[PDB]
């Protein structure tokens, strides 16, 4: 009896598939679909780029952490071909086995060689460097060992974030509802705890996201399952127990928060309440706006590093929505109200299961890469016509 529902559901998943596949040549200017070996838990675009002008493309790089199986937890680097304007394959390589799970693997902005990795299976943060990757040999039987082991938490950490300006400053929010700001240039071989700059207990339920300001050392935000946003400044003395602010942002467990890279005043917040909230720091009594359109849990969100009014959101209904926020308050015809509010811009659904995560390629405009639960990678950019 439950079969019937499951098989129908699988079939309309397939349905959405080739109904996206069928009309692709009228929607996108680029599509690269890659069936990697393994489920890719995360992706992060690499800011260094090769330009083969005579050959006629560019290659960007990607860092993946995948699972081969249970306990087989690995990392890899990919090269990605983008076509050239000014005058075609996805290559996997650099595969190194990890000691334990990866849920979030963040690389330091001003130095690619370092990657802070944590997973849902351990409360230790493992930070890897040049030598750890380059001393590894795929012929060896053992995995890598990171540059450092950072441990203050007692539950696994959910995510991390480097400081974009403060050199070698990191944060780690965990499942035991605590925060930790870390400083690697303050190591001691005798004191692995000297890396511990601050530890905070402001949150009340398991933290889902902690993340720094794009242009500021001392500003970060934390969001937790108790439906609360907390604003932290680390150079506060009372910050170990008192957050800078605490706001009731949503009515469901918050999943993620994104900071506007261009503008230091806007942040975005997603929850299982299928609604996306905006926030401005001079008026925190008030939800800045609310974007509708997902009809089940939204999981994760991100701004565009080229234009700020473009916001991307991913959800459990197998869609990713792109919003151009320059359309607040605008008029829309009667038939134009079908697809949603006019500030909705684009909607991509080429996947077939819960999209794991996204990332913008910062070297090309309008392009994004998404990894999904069905072992699929998607590199896609819409046509000019919708935004040109």
């Amino acid at each position: 009896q439950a079969s019937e529902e499951g098989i129908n559901q699988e079939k309309c998943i397939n349905e959405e598939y080739k109904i996206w596949k069928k009309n692709s040549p009228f929607l996108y200017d680029l599509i690269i679909t890659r069936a990697l070996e393994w489920p890719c838990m995360s992706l992060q675009w690499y800011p260094e780029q090769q330009i083969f002008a005579e050959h006629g493309y560019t290659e960007q790089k990607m860092f993946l952490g995948v699972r081969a199986d249970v306990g087989k937890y690995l990392l890899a680097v990919a090269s990605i071909q983008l076509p050239y304007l000014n005058q075609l394959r996805v290559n996997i390589s650099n595969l190194y086995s990890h000691p334990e799970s990866v849920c979030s693997a963040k690389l330091m902005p001003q130095d690619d060689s370092c990657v802070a990795t944590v997973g849902n299976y351990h409360n230790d943060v493992l930070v890897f460097d040049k030598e750890s990757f380059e001393s590894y040999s795929s012929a060896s039987e053992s995995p890598l060992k990171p540059k450092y082991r950072l441990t203050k938490h007692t539950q696994p950490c959910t995510s991390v974030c480097w400081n974009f300006l403060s050199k070698g400053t990191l944060v780690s929010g965990s499942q035991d509802a605590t925060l930790s700001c870390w400083d690697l240039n303050a190591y001691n071989e005798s004191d692995s705890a000297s890396v511990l700059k601050v530890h905070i207990s402001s949150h009340e339920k398991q933290v889902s996201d902690v993340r720094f300001h794009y242009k500021h050392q001392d500003l970060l935000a934390s969001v937790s399952y108790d439906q609360y946003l907390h604003v932290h400044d680390i150079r506060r003395p009372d910050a170990s127990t008192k957050p800078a602010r605490s706001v009731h942002a949503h009515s469901g467990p918050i999943h993620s928060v994104a900071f506007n890279p261009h503008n230091d005043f806007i942040l975005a917040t997603c929850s299982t309440d299928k609604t996306i909230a905006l926030w401005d720091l001079r008026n925190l009594n008030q939800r800045l706006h609310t974007l509708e359109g997902h009809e089940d849990i939204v999981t994760k969100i991100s701004f565009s590093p080229h234009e700020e009014p473009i916001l991307a959101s991913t959800s459990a209904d197998r869609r990713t929505l792109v919003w151009d926020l320059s359309r607040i308050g605008e008029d829309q015809p009667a038939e134009e109200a079908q697809d949603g509010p006019p500030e909705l811009l684009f909607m991509h659904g080429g996947h077939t299961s819960c999209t794991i995560d996204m990332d913008w390629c910062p070297n090309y405009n309008w392009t994004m890469a998404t990894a999904a639960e069905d072992n699929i990678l998607q590199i896609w950019t819409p046509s000019r016509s919708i935004w040109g």
Partner: protein, 39 residues
């Protein structure tokens, strides 16, 4: 699988209209820190 189709002040002004309309719509040591960071 690869699909390829071979074929600015507007974006900035749309950004600015966003800022303007949205700000027109809009109108503790935390405020102290923020107002230190504001312009």
């Amino acid at each position: 699988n690869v699909y390829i189709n071979s074929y600015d002040q507007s974006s900035q002004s749309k950004k600015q209209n966003r800022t303007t309309n949205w700000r027109r719509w809009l109108e503790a040591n935390t405020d102290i820190k923020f107002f230190s960071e504001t312009t």
